[PDB]
Design a protein around this motif. Structure first.
Motif, PDB file in Angstrom:
ATOM      1  N   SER B  58       1.147  -1.471  -0.258  1.00 23.03           N
ATOM      2  CA  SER B  58       0.274  -0.358  -0.342  1.00 23.03           C
ATOM      3  C   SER B  58       0.549   1.313   0.154  1.00 23.03           C
ATOM      4  O   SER B  58       1.663   1.754   0.872  1.00 23.03           O
ATOM      5  CB  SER B  58      -0.899  -0.456   0.922  1.00 23.03           C
ATOM      6  N   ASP B  59       0.548   2.091  -0.913  1.00 21.24           N
ATOM      7  CA  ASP B  59       1.387   3.366  -1.097  1.00 21.24           C
ATOM      8  C   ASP B  59       1.252   4.155   0.357  1.00 21.24           C
ATOM      9  O   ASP B  59       1.675   5.141   0.756  1.00 21.24           O
ATOM     10  CB  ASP B  59       0.991   4.059  -2.206  1.00 21.24           C
ATOM     11  N   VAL B  60       0.030   4.083   0.712  1.00 25.28           N
ATOM     12  CA  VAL B  60      -0.675   4.834   2.017  1.00 25.28           C
ATOM     13  C   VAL B  60      -0.236   4.331   3.138  1.00 25.28           C
ATOM     14  O   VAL B  60       0.157   5.190   3.750  1.00 25.28           O
ATOM     15  CB  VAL B  60      -1.857   5.097   1.762  1.00 25.28           C
ATOM     16  N   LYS B 214      -0.163  11.647  11.050  1.00 28.19           N
ATOM     17  CA  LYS B 214      -1.384  11.215   9.920  1.00 28.19           C
ATOM     18  C   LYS B 214      -0.963   9.716   9.251  1.00 28.19           C
ATOM     19  O   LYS B 214      -1.908   9.080   8.954  1.00 28.19           O
ATOM     20  CB  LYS B 214      -0.961  11.437   8.387  1.00 28.19           C
ATOM     21  N   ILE B 218      -3.898   7.002   9.825  1.00 29.38           N
ATOM     22  CA  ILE B 218      -4.688   6.521   9.127  1.00 29.38           C
ATOM     23  C   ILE B 218      -4.757   4.723   9.116  1.00 29.38           C
ATOM     24  O   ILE B 218      -6.391   4.641   8.905  1.00 29.38           O
ATOM     25  CB  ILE B 218      -3.843   6.389   7.582  1.00 29.38           C
ATOM     26  N   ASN B 333      -8.854  -1.346   2.849  1.00 28.44           N
ATOM     27  CA  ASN B 333      -7.252  -1.077   3.261  1.00 28.44           C
ATOM     28  C   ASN B 333      -7.719  -1.329   4.423  1.00 28.44           C
ATOM     29  O   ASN B 333      -6.662  -0.525   5.353  1.00 28.44           O
ATOM     30  CB  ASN B 333      -7.467   0.475   2.724  1.00 28.44           C
TER      31      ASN B 333
END
Lengths: 701, 634, 120
Positions: B58-60, B214, B218, B333
């Motif tokens: 996952s890029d996030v 952040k 998340i 996700n």
């Protein structure tokens, strides 16, 4: 309120608005302001559409109107009408449902009512919709806003404008304007949520925009058949026609004599129980006083101070158990009003409470290389034990004692009430004096008292009598004492945590006549009893057990076995009555002229089927429910859940319904994985095998 | 004679004799389905049923993500999550064809309800995860803490009341570089002890202000805790609207069994059976399949649900499609929190210690037992160094029950493969299903069942071969309800518990009678069973509130004067049972308050005293009549 | 988290029921026939007088007679639903395959039986 809506608007508009609300079903009766808003909206639409007629080519006077009302009818047909109009006329179909369609300009239009000022709600709607609708707005105060000129003219506008006058005047006159009559959304996606949407698309798509365009632009026709011709033939259900010869016995290992016999593991003795009876006048007593008087009536059993060990469990200390029993007896026999044991330091080690592993910080535990996770305790695999059958036989019989005295209800005047009353009467006349009834009441009372004394006592190691209140046919009342328990106190108060209960139960059963049944019990001999001039030895079965508050509540609710058994009775009677047209309670119990009393197959004698009355069947049902409850655990739950499928397959075989199976061995393995050490599961497997053999024999003829 | 309970099946049909096998519907105390081991097992199974799909990072959040959708088709009969998007879209398109305008009507109804819904609706749920304290808290407190933290962060959306602004701010919070919130910490602090040191270290529930980054926020927002799992407040606001949409679609489908009215279920089953029988070819055979689904929640992919929502909301404004696309996106996700940890123990030293989830891999795997060691070996690739694991495929709970039912009914709507000589229909109830197949011989019904099995495999639905069977139409099971030639029975029934509601003597009676009436209206309780439930409730009520009859011989605190009340009253029938009066309740009058039931029988004197307008007890669901018995407790 | 057990424990206590302060609340005797109705304790800051469970019985046994006029009208829905059943007639119950009927359903319809119920 509702009267205002009824009087000011006709019934059809009101009911159409109510249906429109019920489409958005939240609470169509709590909020009447929006009812008023919707009804006024529909009134305006009707006023717009109910005179502006048209003709075949161009005459704006046959029967064709120039307006189509797409409000007030269910959205399922409204959307289809909108799509058909858009397709026929070739104009873009709005993404919002239209309130009306104009034929001369062949376009959808939107209408609204503005309390404050027109040309403001009009612009808000324009922001909402854009260039897909022609907006016409009428205001409560004289005002109008239109997006064109060839639409509704002055004569139509007058009716709609004057309609609001009556409502606005009456609401003010009735003081209902300052409290009610007061009536698009923009949602934006950020950067991290957009990125998550981008990376959450299925395989073959780069971003979410590609997936969105794909899903709504390609036709997927023929994909299922295209893929099914591509899947391997090895993906199949492998159906096979079930036959009687395919139903092998479940759990064959229960017949292997090299395995141990299932030990008795219920909380309390059920059929081996021996209750010391003290005749009383029915007055309610405290448990300690009842126990004290019962023990006084039997002083020789109470005063027995030396132990005569008969049997001992492998890891049990007989000295600890005997001293705990003597502590309980002395505590209950004293003149004090507290049930806390006198010797607490000794009781801490006698119950094994002091032998608890101590917690340490995770840092040293991680550093310590000798601390390892404990292997799970695999349940033993045992064979059939005759004591389960003996318990089934003994608990189903009628005794001279009943332990159920339920309160009254109101008189029956409806026929269903009479049916229920007669069914209940026939149930009680059959279950009142069953042994299972007294055993169930004893269990329920014990768990009730166990949870009651689980409060913030801060005294630890109390003594709880195992008592019961009973009555016989003659109406005499007895207080029965079945033994004493010592309950410890867990300071860690979460209602899922083990507290140790050491039970000492009276019995007249010699543990040496069945050694494989009592490996968890330390049994002493404490004296003898004369009930009818015949001497019976009295043994004390001692066992250390554990329970938490949830199991105490479960045991307390075990009384719902009565409701369960009676629901089963009602299901049987209703199934019998479905074939007929009347109530079969009388036929099922006493028999009418057209039908003799029904007999049920109860058991076998020397391999021969034996029949009995519906009352014996009901007692069997009740005791089966009670054993299912007292022996309930994960294994029993799984066995009951899984064997239902085999039972229903056998029913389909009996009914000649042509059953098929896809994995018979898998079903058998799922059922058999639950047969490890539960006495009830193993006995029920044996019973299932016997009944299946009988059904196989009966199928041939 | 040796009693064999199963012999009852010789004389009685098994459906009737097996009714109400379980007297409960909730998990018993011996339900082994919670703990770190079971959560890890669920993660391993979910990733095993999707291990042949795409794998990335996952890029996030940086977690390891697995995508079985559009993967290779299965070549075996184990659970598979490789659902094909094309097949799902075709099924949904056929569903739209059979019910014109249904998708758009459902979308519009859901949108309008969303526009009307308020923030306060996020309180009628159950225990929910709370990121501020990272624990499971009731919905109300979790929502309040989230609102306060957002105010602290300059996100004032709930001040407008609407649910949409609150969700807009809850989505914007994912973009804040840091999130400041209020946390509850058991703070140990000073106290003037009586000891020489004068330090009585003790804890208080203090509230402090904390701040996270952040990425951490998340990950917290995508986390599901262990109660089985529960989700946070950042997902319920979007889940409401998706579920509403699915309910709007499902309540207009004849296959989607949603008749929650007790007798409505019987009517639904009978109508399905009759409709299928009447449609059978002349001389052909109709066969019913009682089915179960293996790993139903572990093989349904949130990506397929996102595509489903995209297809359903096709003709909706872009804002509503974006709003509806968020719940499946957040579920694709998701992060699974693995729980307390594992207990390690030394037997020689009699020591024990709890290894937490973050420190699961801090000790050699040889110090775990075999099963746990293998579980950890398989979990390692998907393990985050904070005590959480990545779970991209599958679901966990009934968060999308209605959408799962929609997918199942879409599968049932194909009805045929290759224009073959069989037609299938059935009932779907969110992991429970019955499939009726009409053909001209049994061998073609089996072909139809096989085709249905393969088609379901193409959509990610795996039906249990070990728990599914079939026979001729007329006898089957659906949602714990046995149907046989018309007669309907229930396998399980939640019998009334022993106790009282716990409000007053006036509210408890109404509550208990309402429970009995609803049990016999919705759960098919019989007359005698309902009457005995009334008897048991009356006994328990009298015992708890010490309000036994005035003519009885029972000593106590309130009874001494209840006897005087009985002796001083001539119309002793009108007395309330809480005053030692008789119990006049029965089946017919179970919906009427007892005060108004006995009003015409109440003595004028007792009627006056009991219903005194300004009595000192009341001060200022269940039917209520104000009186002295509607008192309050400290 | 056990309302029933908590209720039983509350009932067996001495003074678990709050008492609103007023002139009519002072009519309750301090002690009646040796049973402690209301607490003889003056609270420090709350000043909230308490009463025993038996105090709710004495009010219903020897308390002042209230004014029942108008009671019927306030709860007239309940009285209407009662009188609806009172005058209704019952048919015959058969086993096998309006808001008034909806309200009275438990005694009318089952899963395998039906009762004919003509309202009055």
């Amino acid at each position: 309120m509702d009267t205002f809506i009824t009087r000011n608007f006709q019934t059809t508009i009101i009911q159409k608005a109510k249906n429109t609300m019920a489409e958005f079903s939240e609470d169509p009766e709590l909020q009447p302001a929006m009812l008023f808003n919707i009804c006024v909206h529909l009134e305006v639409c009707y006023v717009i559409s109910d005179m502006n007629f048209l003709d075949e080519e161009g005459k704006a006077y046959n029967l064709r109107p120039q307006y189509e009302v797409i409000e007030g009818m269910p959205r399922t047909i409204a959307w289809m009408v909108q799509r058909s109009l858009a397709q026929e006329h070739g104009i873009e179909t709005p993404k919002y449902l239209a309130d009306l369609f104009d034929y001369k300009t062949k376009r959808f239009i939107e209408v609204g009512i503005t309390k404050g000022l027109a040309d403001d709600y009009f612009w808000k709607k324009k922001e909402k919709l854009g260039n897909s609708m022609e907006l016409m707005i009428f205001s409560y105060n004289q005002d109008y806003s239109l997006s064109n000129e060839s639409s509704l003219d002055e004569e139509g506008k007058g009716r709609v404008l004057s309609r609001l006058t009556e409502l606005q005047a009456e609401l003010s006159l009735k003081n209902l304007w300052q409290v009610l009559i007061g009536e698009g959304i923009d949602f934006k996606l950020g950067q991290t949520i957009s990125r998550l949407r981008d990376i959450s698309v299925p395989a073959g798509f780069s971003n979410f925009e590609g997936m969105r365009s794909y899903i709504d632009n390609i036709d997927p026709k023929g994909a299922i058949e295209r893929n099914l011709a591509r899947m391997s033939p090895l993906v199949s259900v492998t159906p096979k026609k079930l036959t009687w010869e395919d139903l092998r016995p479940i759990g064959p290992h229960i017949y292997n004599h090299e395995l141990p016999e299932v030990p008795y593991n219920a909380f309390l003795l059920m059929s081996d129980e021996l209750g010391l009876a003290n005749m009383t006048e029915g007055k309610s007593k405290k448990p300690k006083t009842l126990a004290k008087e019962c023990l006084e009536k039997y002083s020789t059993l109470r005063d027995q101070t030396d132990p005569i060990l008969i049997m001992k469990s492998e890891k049990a200390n007989e000295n600890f158990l005997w001293k705990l029993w003597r502590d309980c007896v002395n505590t209950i026999s004293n003149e004090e009003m507290s049930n806390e044991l006198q010797k607490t330091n000794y009781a801490k080690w006698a119950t094994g409470d002091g032998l608890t592993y101590q917690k340490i910080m995770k840092e040293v535990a991680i550093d310590d290389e000798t601390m390892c996770q404990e292997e799970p305790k695999i349940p033993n695999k045992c064979r059939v034990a005759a004591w389960v059958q003996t318990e089934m036989n003994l608990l189903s019989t009628l005794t001279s004692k009943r332990a159920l005295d339920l309160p009254e209800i109101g008189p029956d005047v409806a026929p269903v009430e009479h049916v229920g009353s007669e069914r209940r009467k026939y149930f009680v006349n059959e279950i009142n004096y069953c042994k299972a009834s007294t055993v169930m009441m004893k269990y329920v009372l014990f768990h009730t008292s166990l949870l009651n004394e689980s409060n913030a006592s801060m005294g630890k190691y109390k003594v709880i009598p195992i008592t019961n209140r009973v009555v016989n046919e003659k109406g005499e009342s007895f207080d029965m004492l079945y033994g004493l328990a010592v309950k410890g106190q867990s300071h860690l108060r979460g209602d899922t945590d083990v507290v140790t209960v050491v039970t000492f139960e009276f019995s007249s059963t010699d543990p040496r006549v069945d050694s494989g049944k009592w490996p968890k019990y330390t049994v002493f001999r404490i004296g003898s009893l004369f009930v009818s001039g015949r001497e019976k030895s009295v043994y004390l079965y001692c066992r250390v057990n554990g329970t938490n508050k949830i199991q105490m509540k479960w045991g307390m609710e075990a009384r719902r076995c009565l409701l369960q058994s009676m629901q089963q009775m009602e299901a049987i009677v209703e199934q019998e009555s479905s074939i007929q047209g009347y109530d079969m309670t009388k036929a099922c119990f006493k028999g009418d002229r057209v039908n003799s009393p029904k007999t049920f197959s109860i058991g076998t004698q020397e391999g021969k089927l034996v029949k009995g009355s519906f009352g014996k069947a009901l007692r069997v049902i009740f005791t089966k429910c009670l054993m299912h409850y007292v022996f309930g655990n994960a294994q029993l739950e799984g066995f009951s859940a899984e064997s239902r499928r085999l039972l229903l397959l056998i029913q389909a075989l009996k009914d000649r319904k042509g059953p098929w199976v896809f994995d018979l061995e898998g079903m058998y393995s799922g059922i058999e994985e639950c047969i490890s050490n539960n006495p009830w599961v193993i006995q029920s497997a044996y019973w299932f095998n016997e009944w299946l053999g009988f059904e196989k024999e009966g199928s041939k003829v | 004679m040796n009693i064999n309970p199963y012999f009852l099946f010789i004389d009685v049909p098994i459906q009737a004799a097996i009714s109400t096998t379980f007297p409960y519907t909730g998990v018993p105390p011996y339900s082994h389905g919670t703990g770190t081991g079971y959560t890890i097992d669920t993660v391993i199974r979910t990733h095993e049923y999707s291990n042949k799909g795409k794998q990335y990072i996952s890029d996030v959040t940086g977690c390891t993500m697995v995508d079985p959708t559009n993967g290779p088709l299965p070549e075996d009969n184990e659970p598979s999550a490789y659902a094909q998007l094309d097949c799902v879209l075709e099924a949904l398109d056929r569903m739209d064809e059979e019910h014109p305008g249904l998708f758009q009507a459902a979308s519009q109804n859901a949108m309008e309800t969303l526009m009307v819904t308020t923030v306060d609706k996020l309180t009628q749920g159950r225990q929910t995860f709370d990121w501020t304290v990272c624990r499971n808290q009731p919905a109300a407190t979790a929502l309040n803490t989230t609102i306060t933290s957002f105010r602290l962060n300059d996100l004032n959306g709930a001040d407008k009341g609407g649910l949409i602004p609150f969700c807009q701010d809850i989505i914007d919070s994912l973009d804040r570089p840091e999130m400041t919130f209020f946390s509850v910490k058991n703070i140990k602090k000073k106290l003037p002890a009586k000891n020489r040191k004068g330090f009585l270290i003790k804890r208080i529930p203090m509230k402090v202000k904390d701040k996270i980054t952040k990425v951490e926020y998340i990950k917290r927002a995508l986390s599901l805790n262990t109660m089985i799992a529960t989700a946070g407040i950042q997902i319920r606001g979007f889940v409401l609207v998706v579920e509403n949409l699915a309910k709007n679609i499902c309540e207009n489908l004849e296959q989607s069994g949603l008749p929650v009215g007790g007798n409505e279920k019987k009517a639904k089953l009978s109508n399905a059976v009759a409709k299928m029988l009447s449609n059978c070819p002349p001389g052909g055979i109709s066969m019913t399949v009682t089915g179960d689904n293996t790993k139903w929640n572990e093989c349904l992919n949130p990506r397929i649900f996102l595509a489903m929502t995209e297809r359903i909301t096709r003709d909706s404004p872009i804002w509503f499609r974006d709003f509806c696309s968020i719940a499946p996106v957040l579920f694709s996700n998701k992060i699974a929190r693995l729980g307390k940890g594992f207990m390690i123990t030394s037997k020689t030293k009699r020591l024990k210690a709890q290894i937490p989830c973050p420190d699961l891999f801090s000790i050699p795997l040889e110090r775990y037992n075999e099963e746990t060691r293998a579980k950890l070996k398989k979990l390692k690739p998907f393990f985050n160094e904070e005590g959480t694991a990545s779970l991209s495929p599958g679901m966990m709970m009934g968060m999308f029950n209605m959408l799962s039912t929609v997918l199942g009914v879409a599968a049932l709507g194909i009805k045929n493969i290759g224009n073959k000589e069989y037609l299938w229909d059935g009932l779907q109830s969110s992991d429970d299903f019955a499939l009726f197949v009409n053909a001209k011989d049994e061998e073609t019904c089996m072909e139809g069942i096989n085709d249905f099995y393969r088609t379901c495999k193409l959509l990610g639905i795996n039906m249990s071969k070990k728990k599914s069977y079939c026979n001729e139409t007329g006898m089957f099971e659906f949602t714990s309800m046995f149907y046989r030639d018309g007669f309907v029975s229930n396998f399980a029934m939640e019998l009334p518990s022993f106790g009282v509601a716990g409000v007053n003597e006036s509210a408890d009676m109404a509550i208990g009678m309402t429970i009995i009436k609803n049990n016999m209206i919705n759960n098919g309780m019989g007359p005698a069973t309902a009457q005995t439930a009334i008897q048991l409730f009356i006994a328990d009520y009298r015992y708890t509130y010490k309000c036994h009859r005035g003519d009885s011989k029972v000593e106590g605190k309130r009874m001494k004067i209840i006897k005087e009340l009985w002796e001083n009253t001539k119309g002793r029938d009108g007395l309330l049972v809480a005053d030692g009066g008789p119990n006049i309740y029965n089946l017919r009058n179970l919906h009427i308050p007892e005060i108004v039931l006995k009003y015409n029988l109440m003595d004028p004197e007792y009627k006056g005293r009991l219903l005194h307008p300004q009595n000192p007890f009341v001060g200022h669901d269940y039917d209520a009549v104000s009186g002295t018995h509607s008192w309050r407790t400290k | 988290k056990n309302p029933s057990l908590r209720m039983k424990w509350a009932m067996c206590s001495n003074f678990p029921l709050a008492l609103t302060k007023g002139d009519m609340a002072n009519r309750i005797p301090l002690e009646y026939k040796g049973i402690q109705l209301k607490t003889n304790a003056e609270d420090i800051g709350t000043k909230g007088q308490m009463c025993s469970i038996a105090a709710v019985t004495w009010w219903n046994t020897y308390g002042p007679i209230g004014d029942t006029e108008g009671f019927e009208r306030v709860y007239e829905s309940f009285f209407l639903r009662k009188m609806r059943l009172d005058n209704a007639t019952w048919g015959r119950i058969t086993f096998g395959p309006s808001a008034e009927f909806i309200e009275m359903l438990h005694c009318l319809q089952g899963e395998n039986w039906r009762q004919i119920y003509h309202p009055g």
